[PDB]
Amino acid sequence: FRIAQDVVARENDRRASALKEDYEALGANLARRGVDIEAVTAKVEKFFVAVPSWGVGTGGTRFARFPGTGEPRGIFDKLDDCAVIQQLTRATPNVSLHIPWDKADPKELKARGDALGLGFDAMNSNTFSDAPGQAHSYKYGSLSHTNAATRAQAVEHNLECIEIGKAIGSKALTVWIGDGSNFPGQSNFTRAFERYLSAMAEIYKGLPDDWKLFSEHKMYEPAFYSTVVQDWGTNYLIAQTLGPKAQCLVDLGHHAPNTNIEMIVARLIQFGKLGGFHFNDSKYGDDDLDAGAIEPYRLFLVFNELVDAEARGVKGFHPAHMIDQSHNVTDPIESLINSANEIRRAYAQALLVDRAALSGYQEDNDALMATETLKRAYRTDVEPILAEARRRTGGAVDPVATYRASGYRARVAAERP
Amino acid sequence: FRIAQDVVARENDRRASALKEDYEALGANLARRGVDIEAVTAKVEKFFVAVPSWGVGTGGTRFARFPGTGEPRGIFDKLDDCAVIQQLTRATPNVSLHIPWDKADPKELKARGDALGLGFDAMNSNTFSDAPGQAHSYKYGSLSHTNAATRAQAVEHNLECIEIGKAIGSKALTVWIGDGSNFPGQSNFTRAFERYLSAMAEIYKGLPDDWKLFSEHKMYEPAFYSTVVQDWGTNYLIAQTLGPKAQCLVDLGHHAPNTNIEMIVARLIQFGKLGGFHFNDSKYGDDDLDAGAIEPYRLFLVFNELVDAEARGVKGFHPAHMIDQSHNVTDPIESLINSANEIRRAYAQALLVDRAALSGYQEDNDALMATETLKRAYRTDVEPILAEARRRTGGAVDPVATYRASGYRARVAAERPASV
Amino acid sequence: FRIAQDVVARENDRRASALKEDYEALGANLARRGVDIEAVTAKVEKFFVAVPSWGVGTGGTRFARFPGTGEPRGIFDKLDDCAVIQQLTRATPNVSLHIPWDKADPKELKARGDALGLGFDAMNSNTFSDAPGQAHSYKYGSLSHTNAATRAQAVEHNLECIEIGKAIGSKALTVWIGDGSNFPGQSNFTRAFERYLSAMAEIYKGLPDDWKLFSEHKMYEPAFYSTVVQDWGTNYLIAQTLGPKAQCLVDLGHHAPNTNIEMIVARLIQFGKLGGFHFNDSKYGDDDLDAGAIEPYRLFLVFNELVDAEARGVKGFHPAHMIDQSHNVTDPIESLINSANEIRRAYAQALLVDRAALSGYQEDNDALMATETLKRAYRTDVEPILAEARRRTGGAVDPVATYRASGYRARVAAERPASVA
Amino acid sequence: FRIAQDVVARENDRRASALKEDYEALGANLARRGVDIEAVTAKVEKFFVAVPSWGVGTGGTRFARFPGTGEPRGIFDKLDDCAVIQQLTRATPNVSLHIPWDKADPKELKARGDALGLGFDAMNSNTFSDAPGQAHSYKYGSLSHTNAATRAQAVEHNLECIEIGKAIGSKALTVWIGDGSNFPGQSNFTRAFERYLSAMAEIYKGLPDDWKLFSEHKMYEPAFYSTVVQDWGTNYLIAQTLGPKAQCLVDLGHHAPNTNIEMIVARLIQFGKLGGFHFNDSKYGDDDLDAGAIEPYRLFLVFNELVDAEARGVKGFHPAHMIDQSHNVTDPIESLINSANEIRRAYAQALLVDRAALSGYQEDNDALMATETLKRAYRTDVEPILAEARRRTGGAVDPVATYRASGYRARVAAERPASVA
Ligand SMILES: [Zn+2]
Ligand SMILES: [Zn+2]
Ligand SMILES: [Zn+2]
Ligand SMILES: [Zn+2]
Ligand SMILES: [Zn+2]
Ligand SMILES: [Zn+2]
Ligand SMILES: [Zn+2]
Ligand SMILES: [Zn+2]
């Protein structure tokens, strides 16, 4: 236990009475609306989202990085910190690894995970930066590089990520590359894409049949003119071309300004290529801010489509859920705690939508009541449900408050001078 | 002839000396660059773009419309005006019609076109507005409307456009609808798209063996929250789902801010679904401004992809070209003339690109020289080539100048009563 | 009463029990948070936003307009409909007129207003479209037109708006024009703005002592290359140049993609030039959608700045709030009703923010708790406060439900003839 | 000379014939247009833009940096490389320094510059990152930080930048900070701006009377929610507030999507606050790409506003011109060479505009001929003028060609340490 159980129990008891009052009131309110709060809490406590090992430490920009105290010094420290997030929120039992940043004896990683009560989500390859001893540079690309030997090297790296994953229980490989161009003419759009598809086909050939391959589109950065996998349209072509095991991953901050992302989510679901999500929030570009901190309604609307798919009869629908954020000016652990909470919040609210009523308003083209139907769910303060779900599962009623009362940050600051 | 042959000849003679000098000078510059100017001219004279019947009349915004003088009223007035653009530019032999706006006796339409030396490009359906006596309103959608009878009516209208097109020589139907929602929850994204696909499948069934069906995506407007056919991704799904005769149409101003449009073009080409292009320019949204008036380099880059597709003989590459613009503050005829000119200008420049050198710089990852290889082409003033092509084919050296010297606008202003 | 009181009473009685349970539950929660729900409700019931006369009629785009039934035939019908919104929401006692669309004898306008219990907010001039018998067209502009005779015509029109406003009780004139260019080179940016400043200086001379002149910026549309009053920067330059009576009006959907609108509001307030705010929502451009329907958090953040100004003891700050929307696919009256509710919703939430704690988190650079402090307020469902505020002031617990129960739309549908040409 | 004079001579002679043909051909075309090519060439060879000392090395993103061969180790190597750009293009006689990156003995800097034929442009302070042994961190801001001692430390740094500049011949200080917030509520927009203004006032007081203080606005990055100096509006307020010596710096890639940047330039000129420009190109955000590589027409339109002013008299109008780019996938020297060339290209084309004709089409509202009047100039290939200007002033006809023929990159690669990931 990263956080002393006595502290968790102490901070829960301190807020137990108020929570009971809020939960009961909400329970009565939902009962008046024909909803059993218990049924919602039950689903909420089972909603999980993977935390990024690379978000456990303070992030930075091309201009600077401002580390705080007790910065994790490696993957093992990072797992220790991730365990705090899980213990308190109970919403992040799995960690997403990134190779080579997190390279270490896989057996030891799995060992530290089991001890901490953490599992591992999809693996993440890295051919957007050069590692020491690398024969070919990814300066001008990786999986779509003009040099055959460079593409082969990139493929081998991804195959190595799969091997690592198999040793720790991972069942998927996420591939995001910076491949693209900064100048018109620098790259031939079609040939670069053909090269990418050929290299991804090789990775697919080496992909275990009990694994999935997620390709992640991004409009720009690091490439500032064109990017090979620029949007969901190219991403769909990729997944469809590679095979059933290949699906698309949607990072919320990777779209052009004003994009209707919830529609992209719906389209991918309809054609069975929605592999999963990379949650975060943003205002300008791929800001990688705490989920729901800028546009909480958009987050709700994305979950509205996920829940709608279930309501529509889509069977065995279980897209992968992962947080992909950068914490530049806050305690990384606190931001991850509240981000996971925010994701559960949007999910909970989506579960409250009166699907029958919404359906009737859509068929009758009553736009005002249709949108109001979504708002009645979104406006509902589900915090009592999120807190109770945590309390009932070993977490904290108020995670950040408990985290600070524990003095964990000061603790690791002393341990990690 | 809409414009007196004597005036065209006269306005050409007055500018022949300067054109001679510039063409020969450009010819020498290109020769030193290993390019035969005549070869470029040969291709430029064969590039055509369809003019929209709805473009020769003054356009407007939701706030107002400020008509000029001699405003064409019926499709007959419009064809007469479109004939001016073709005569002077020789780059717009075909006109794109819009139903019911241009609804008229097919036989009469065909006869008027033949008499003016004009053909007809793709038909354009209209289920984004209500016509008088219409049984079902398209307020809440058309092809994807929740009411079956409404979708049936929309489908029938499109089938009618196909019948009209067959009678006048058209070989395609372009479908752009405003279908979408203005509020979250108003529409179920998936079911709306299912209804759309189902209705489009019916239209597809009415397509003759040699016809194409073009679906056109648009991010927003008139729908301000979601749009069924919002982007090229959804558009590709439509084309792929419907079949070989279904392809995607790319309207330059229908993309999210900062979108790399030329890439979308390349992607559609690779997968054989680039049905055609709707040319115009823009800065903020679907501004529908004169092609090349805002971002001429972007236009060149789109053409760079088109010329490249040709150079490598890509399978199924044969997009239709059409201008889709609104002229709110200029003489519609002059704007279409110069827009058509800019389109040929961008094409001509793309033809100048040293493909062999570019390929080399691309393979060696010499980004600087690669972008410079494109710039050397784009920076070249190809006006002499465009002008000489027009001169040799019955057009005007300086189209707008000849148009103004002819006094055409004043002529039709006298024949067409202004509202005030 | 446009809506029968017995209908309002029956619908409120039908929802009394649920309202009581929710309001009291929320009240207890807020109490535990050290907040007096009574104090909030008292301020909410007093927050008003003007309704646009042109908003009760169905709107459209350049592609088409799909009118509903009972479209108002004129200003008098529009006033009648605005009376409905006010009666049910009690948040819209003042109406904003647009000339020449609402032109009519001022004495009659005033008479109908008083009869309905409505007042009049800022006047709105129209030089973005041509009126009949107009000696000069506004095709190439109005107040910034190259032709002096055209600018003079636009000035005289605005002066007329001021005269009408004076007779009905208005105290401000809002000026939004489409002036701009669609092509590079078409206009000399500087000279066009200089011409605009000249015309506005003239309009300014006709302002009574207690009147305000509001200039409204817009990035684009109807102009698609450049716009004279394109952003808040140019807008500030205008207000500062004209004088103490000149201030800037911020319309939510008039900004470039991703703009931080709430910051612009803070800036204008800091320099005493925030005249008013036109409320609406949008996702792509100037969509003019129902306020809070697309980005409710942004609306809350805008109010956060408004409330913070009062928190920083800003002096002489009395912004004019107005709804400026277009209802293309809904009953205009219903949308204005829920939009006004949304606006009060965001205001209520902003009042819930613990400024003391927030200021503390800001000082210590505790970004996480600072943003959470705002979220604790935004996440709060204040609907019971909004409903109780309505009940107390003679409004409806559920405005739209009550509106539909009254059969108002079908009633006016049989009294108003649509257009046939 | 960084590049052997015989190499420059040989590479010019090899292209002299074709250049003569192109220049005379263009000369004849311009004559037919009533334009004297000699008058244009004379102005072109006198147009200069400062080069960023930090743009000489390979740039990177937050994801990675892929340095090339012969990366400059310090300011002295950077100066040596900037000398290549100036010798070959003759358009970059001054270098802009960044402190503490280029911290060095002022006398050695001045000596090296004088020996290389290079001067120094505006100084650039750095309070957007922490340096070793720094007492206070700029993590939560600098000039607007909530901590008084942190603001004081930031102010002192800028004053030190001024001292260094006075010793080497600089006459301006450019201030760009990342100050802002990543979360709503983290910062109080108004208070933070007030702190920024107070700190800048202290820097202004220490500014020599013959110097200029340039504030640079940026919409976002590194701050991802709000930025203190986010746009030209706030920037104008800063400059006007600080005083006559304070002006606004416009960086092309620092504006919201679809912003009409050329209008901003016009507005700043109109109110005498256009301090200067930071040239670069972009498609998505502050991409910092080679000038004119993405939107050459936008670059021309900006120069159109500059030349219009230049032509319409406007005394004492000497905006500072600087290139601010990051070269992540090309030889930094080559990109700066072609970028400076592109900048002169836009200027030359702007000089070709028939101002009288344009004025006429604007006053007549002949939008089409107005835009075509600009296009006639923009469509003209002025490369012969740029090349001849270089040839006549000791530069190279084809800069990059000569640069490569000289084998300079291979040369410095062998004189400098190898770079790592
Ligand atoms: Zn991601
Ligand atoms: Zn990302
Ligand atoms: Zn179109
Ligand atoms: Zn359009
Ligand atoms: Zn407005
Ligand atoms: Zn507006
Ligand atoms: Zn800069
Ligand atoms: Zn920058």
Side-chain angles (χ1 to χ4, degrees), chain B residues 24 35 79 112 157 176 203 284 302 364 368 387:
Chain B
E24 304 186 323
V35 175
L79 286 180
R112 186 59 274 180
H157 170 253
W176 171 74
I203 304 301
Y284 306 98
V302 165
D364 296 316
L368 182 110

Side-chain angles (χ1 to χ4, degrees), chain C residues 222-303:
Chain C
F224 301 115
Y225 169 56
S226 82
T227 293
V228 182
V229 190
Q230 100 284 34
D231 63 23
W232 82 279
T234 290
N235 209 349
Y236 173 74
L237 292 174
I238 292 168
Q240 187 55 42
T241 299
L242 300 183
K245 299 176 186 173
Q247 286 180 144
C248 312
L249 187 153
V250 183
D251 184 312
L252 274 172
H254 287 196
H255 313 267
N258 303 340
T259 299
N260 185 315
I261 302 172
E262 50 270 31
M263 172 168 272
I264 287 166
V265 172
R267 291 283 183 277
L268 291 176
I269 291 177
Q270 186 183 336
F271 289 82
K273 291 300 187 178
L274 191 290
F277 202 98
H278 275 188
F279 293 100
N280 52 56
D281 220 343
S282 57
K283 175 174 181 62
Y284 305 98
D286 178 39
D287 314 334
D288 290 321
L289 296 169
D290 298 26
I294 305 301
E295 283 196 53
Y297 194 46
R298 171 171 60 185
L299 180 57
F300 163 77
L301 294 183
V302 163
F303 267 100

Side-chain angles (χ1 to χ4, degrees), chain A residues 72 83 155 294 297 320 323 356 362 368 371:
Chain A
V155 172
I294 308 300
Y297 195 39
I323 289 175
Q362 299 177 322
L368 184 100
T371 211

Side-chain angles (χ1 to χ4, degrees), chain A residues 1-22:
Chain A
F1 295 116
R2 299 300 296 170
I3 307 301
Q5 291 190 299
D6 63 293
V7 173
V8 174
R10 191 192 314 302
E11 294 313 312
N12 278 356
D13 298 325
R14 184 191 306 294
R15 305 172 170 70
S17 188
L19 178 57
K20 177 179 173 299
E21 292 296 290
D22 290 325

Side-chain angles (χ1 to χ4, degrees), chain D residues 43 48 103 152 160 162 207 210 271 277 288 301 325 341 376 393 414 416-417:
Chain D
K43 287 187 177 303
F48 311 124
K103 193 67 187 63
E160 180 184 307
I162 296 174
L207 191 82
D210 65 322
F271 289 78
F277 291 94
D288 288 320
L301 294 178
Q325 303 165 178
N341 287 173
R376 286 176 178 175
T393 58
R416 299 165 185 176

Side-chain angles (χ1 to χ4, degrees), chain B residues 107-293:
Chain B
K107 290 184 179 63
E108 238 186 315
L109 282 174
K110 184 58 172 54
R112 186 59 274 180
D114 296 336
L116 295 171
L118 296 172
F120 298 103
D121 216 87
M123 298 298 295
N124 291 275
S125 55
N126 183 337
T127 60
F128 53 74
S129 61
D130 288 343
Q134 192 173 296
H136 305 292
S137 172
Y138 293 138
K139 183 169 186 168
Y140 301 113
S142 59
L143 295 173
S144 69
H145 195 296
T146 57
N147 186 58
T150 299
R151 301 199 297 285
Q153 173 186 287
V155 163
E156 181 49 52
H157 170 253
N158 277 274
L159 292 177
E160 175 174 294
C161 294
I162 293 177
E163 285 304 299
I164 301 305
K166 296 196 299 183
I168 63 178
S170 176
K171 295 295 182 174
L173 172 62
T174 293
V175 180
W176 171 74
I177 61 181
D179 294 36
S181 58
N182 287 1
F183 301 97
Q186 173 180 176
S187 308
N188 179 294
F189 301 146
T190 298
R191 289 169 177 160
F193 193 39
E194 297 179 323
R195 293 192 291 275
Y196 170 92
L197 294 175
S198 182
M200 282 290 277
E202 287 184 53
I203 304 301
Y204 189 102
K205 295 184 296 181
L207 292 171
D209 292 308
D210 65 342
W211 267 60
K212 285 294 195 307
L213 177 60
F214 304 136
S215 43
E216 167 175 15
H217 60 272
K218 191 180 185 178
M219 185 183 202
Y220 66 100
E221 187 195 38
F224 301 118
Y225 168 57
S226 85
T227 291
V228 180
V229 189
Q230 98 287 34
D231 62 20
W232 82 279
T234 289
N235 210 351
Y236 177 74
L237 293 178
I238 292 169
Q240 196 55 38
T241 297
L242 295 183
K245 296 193 279 191
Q247 299 184 307
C248 312
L249 182 145
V250 180
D251 185 306
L252 301 184
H254 291 191
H255 310 269
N258 301 334
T259 297
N260 185 312
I261 299 171
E262 50 272 23
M263 174 163 281
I264 292 177
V265 171
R267 292 283 184 271
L268 288 172
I269 290 175
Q270 184 183 347
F271 292 84
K273 290 301 191 178
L274 184 70
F277 248 114
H278 266 192
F279 290 107
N280 54 61
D281 214 344
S282 58
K283 180 175 177 64
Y284 306 98
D286 179 40
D287 309 333
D288 291 330
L289 299 172
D290 303 10

